[PDB]
Structures are given as C-alpha cells and as structure tokens.
Amino acid sequence: MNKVLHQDLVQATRRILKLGPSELRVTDAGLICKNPNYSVCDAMLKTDTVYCVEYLLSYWESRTDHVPCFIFKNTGCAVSLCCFVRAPRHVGEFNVLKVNESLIVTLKDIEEIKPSAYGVLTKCVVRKSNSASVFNIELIAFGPENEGEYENLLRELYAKKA
C-alpha cells in the first residue's frame, strides 16, 4: 500500500460507481498503509441505482494483486459499501440486510453466483424494503445486448495487448 495506489483506487471507485464527491468517505492514506483492517474508502449507495460491483472488485485486484473484499452495511437508514484491499456472512443472488448487519462480497462470491464465467458482468442494486429500515441487495448478472458486437470487441482487445 502506498500513496499513488491509494489515489488510484479512490479515483477509480468514484468513476466506476459514478459517485458525487459527497458520496465517498476516504480513510487517510497514511493510516491505511499501517492498518489494512481499515477500509480505503466507503461509498454511499443510493437505492434503485445499478452499481458495477464486479467491475470495481476486479479493478482493485488488477492494481493490488491482492484479493479484495467489499462489505455492504446497513447503517440504519442507509447502505454503505466499505472497500478493503484484504479481508480481516456472504452475498447470494438476493439478500436481506437489516440494521447493523453486514454482507461480504468478494470475486469468489460473485463467481459462485454467476451462471457462466465469460461475457458476464455482475452488478448490484439496493432496494428499500416493505417495512422497517431494512434493505434488499440484488446481484444481477449482465451479458451483451448483441453477441456479435462482443466477440468483435474481444478480438480488438486481444490485438491491443502487448
């Protein structure tokens, strides 16, 4: 863990989750070098909004070379996603999350939910539940609109890698 890595992951978390500057809490870079059990940053998740959680997880891993671990928290009247580089109750396709409860998502967990490995990107949505201050967390896997477009783009991407 270092400063630029810290900047990198914070910026990417804003970009990938499409957050306002208001919606992300950042632990001090100096603090998190020394304490990996604290989170790099924590994102406010709006309800009814699709968030690219697999994409974000894989982004982190590609830069840390460490298996990341994000935690959904029901903090009482809000869900936050707390982003950890390492880890210290895991996600399924649909999840009930009550006040004080936590739900861990890793790449391994996404993997077990999703139906096929390739051409599949998993996202998530938070919904406000019928009664109480309880939220539901859906994980939803997405494919290409058109499989031709997608085969093409891969070939292009194969050609880029050097």
Partner 1 sequence: LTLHDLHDIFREHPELELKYLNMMKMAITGKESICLPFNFHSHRQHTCLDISPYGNEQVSRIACTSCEDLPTASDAMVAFINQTSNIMKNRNFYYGFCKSSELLKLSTNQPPIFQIYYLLHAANHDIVPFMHAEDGRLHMHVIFENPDVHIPCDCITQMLTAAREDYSVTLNIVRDHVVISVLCHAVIDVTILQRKIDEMDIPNDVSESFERYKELIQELCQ
Contact segment (CB under 8 A) with partner 1 among 25-33, 38-46, 76-84, 134-142 equals 134-142
- Judged by beta carbon, residue 62 or residue 75, the one nearer partner 1 is 62
Residue 86's nearest CA partner among 102, 97, 101, 71 is: 71
Of the pair 31, 132, the CB lying nearest partner 1 is at 132
Q: Is 68 exposed, middle or buried (0-12, 13-18, 19+ CB in 10 A)?
A: buried
Residue from 41, 54, 74, 124 binding partner 1 (CB under 8 A): 54
Q: Can residue 77 be called a binding residue for partner 1 (CB under 8 A)?
A: no
Does 46 participate in binding partner 1 (rule CB under 8 A)?
Answer: no
CB of 30 to partner 1, least distance (A): 26
With contact defined as beta carbons under 8 Å apart, do 69 and 61 qualify?
no
- Burial call 72-95: b when 16+ CB within 10 Å, e when fewer: bbbeeeebbbbbbbeeeeebeeeb
- Which of 19-27, 80-88, 97-105, 110-118 is the region at the interface with partner 1 (rule: CB under 8 A)? 110-118
Is position 92 an interface residue for partner 1 (rule: CB under 8 A)?
Answer: no
CA–CA separation, 17 vs 83, rounded Å?
Answer: 12
Which of residues 38 and 94 has its CB atom nearest to partner 1 in the complex? Answer: 94
Query: Total number of residues binding partner 1 (CB under 8 A)?
Result: 39
Count Cβ atoms within 10 A of the Cβ of residue 44 and give its class: 0-12 exposed, 13-18 middle, 19 or more buried.
Answer: middle
Angstrom distance (rounded) from CA 94 to CA 78: 17
Q: Which of 21, 76, 88, 115 binds partner 1 (CB under 8 A)?
A: 115
Cα 26 from Cα 41, distance rounded (Å): 4
Residues that bind partner 1 (CB under 8 A): 52, 54-55, 58-59, 61-63, 93-94, 113-115, 120-121, 127-131, 136, 138-146, 149-150, 153-154, 156-158, 160-161
